[PDB]
Amino acid sequence: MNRRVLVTGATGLLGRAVHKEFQQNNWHAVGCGFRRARPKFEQVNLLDSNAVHHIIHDFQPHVIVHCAAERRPDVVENQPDAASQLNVDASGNLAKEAAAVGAFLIYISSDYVFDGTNPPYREEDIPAPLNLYGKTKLDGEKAVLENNLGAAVLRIPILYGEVEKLEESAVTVMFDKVQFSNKSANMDHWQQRFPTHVKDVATVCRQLAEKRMLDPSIKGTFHWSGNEQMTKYEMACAIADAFNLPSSHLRPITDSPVLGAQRPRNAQLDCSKLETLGIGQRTPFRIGIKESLWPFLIDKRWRQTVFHAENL
């Protein structure tokens, strides 16, 4: 489309895919990053209200896709006031600036706003976050929707895609456990997950934006999710199957974990609202994960002691 789009968090796992989607569909796509921004992207600290103000009013975007967030529970628990400032305050300020320029803001939220006791969750179901991250994401939605009426909230589950490091994604972190066949690996078989490709969420954003460019009623809360239900165990096995690797060493743990009280068992998102717009894309997990992980597939060759016990 002949429109301008600004993508916050363009250096991140989802942001990279959102920027690619828009750009490849001939939008004037401008991406934002921070530590990893330059040279590919704009270096804008979302915590600096003036920088945010200046790039938005200079670029004059039609759409703003807000991906930038603190999603790491290690940083959200250790630095709770820095997490709130980025996941809540920065989003709210972005909504104020989106409103001033007349830009359609898409706030990216999480399935972690729900307690995962009563799936599937419809957009207008009561959120009950069991962790501070979900609470910051929930308070982020409230901040966005308070300061910008026409904004949209897109709730999505566990993401995977082309990663810079295996730790960039909760699905991709377990690749090494699957590759070290000599050592038994304990894998969660309790929490129900819906692995979603960032490529597919990026399509949903572009489509939603493109719908809004013709229909002013495209606003509010939306849910997007992959339709393949999987536990971390089933995922680990699916990864093994994709690469034709053994999964005999992988042990399922059906029991609720120690931190299980702070994690939603099944926060399944009902996607009927978006499906009502004809919006959506679903890359089969076995295809998507193979695309994502093949560079990290260790070719032993000369590496005789690489799979050694005291190495990871």
Added chain:
Amino acid sequence: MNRRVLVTGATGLLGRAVHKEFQQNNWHAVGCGFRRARPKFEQVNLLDSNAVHHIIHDFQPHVIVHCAAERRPDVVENQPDAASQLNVDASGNLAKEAAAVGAFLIYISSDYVFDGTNPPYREEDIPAPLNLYGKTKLDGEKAVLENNLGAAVLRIPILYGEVEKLEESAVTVMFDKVQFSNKSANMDHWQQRFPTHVKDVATVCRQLAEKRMLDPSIKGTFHWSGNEQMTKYEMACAIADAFNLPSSHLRPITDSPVLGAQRPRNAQLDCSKLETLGIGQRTPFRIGIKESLWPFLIDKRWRQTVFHAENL
């Protein structure tokens, strides 16, 4: 050549170029990294003696080019025992393992081992480091040459090349000062520097390795440097000239700085020993820097307030 080469610090500024040089010249090049290793390279902590031992004896390299180091004076001063462990202890252990496999080790050193009072410095001139970094690099040479007789030390000056971030290189960090023409910039015109392209140091490593594969006398201390003498000011102006940008805003400071007592004024390296082997390559600074920085050249376009005073 039909030989195997292991490059430590392959993720770093110099390491990336050394690995490319060897690989492009049909060597069996295997690169090592740490935080940025995967998927392109091997993840080996040089501080873990077992990991170092295992990769060296598995790969059985003919040559080892040791680039990995703590070169940041901010980390060398704040964490002096972690800097010594990597710049000294890890190098020495690498020399012990190079010796055990019968691999030609090239230790990359610095012009900062000299006090820069009596240039040009010949390889057998007395080193006198004015800072802890230079002292760790000097003690690194001693560690290497003590534990491996046949090893080579390659002393090089200020490096530049294709950077991931402008901060990756002391030459490239000043690009933003050169680009912000609206603000006057104070540039050092005291310390004499010899900006050297990593591409050119990488050629010198390959050539030295290839010479050693036929001549067992290729060992000891060597010096490599670009032949263009420049102060940070002259460099900043040369960068401006390369891109056809004004340099009127750039102010030279001929006076010795506050930290000037800890920096060698002119640690010019005499390269006659390598020139005696027919070794060397010299990319003209104006060509080399243009290749290195063009991705970081800001195209204003819609970015009206990007060059604003309260932004950098």
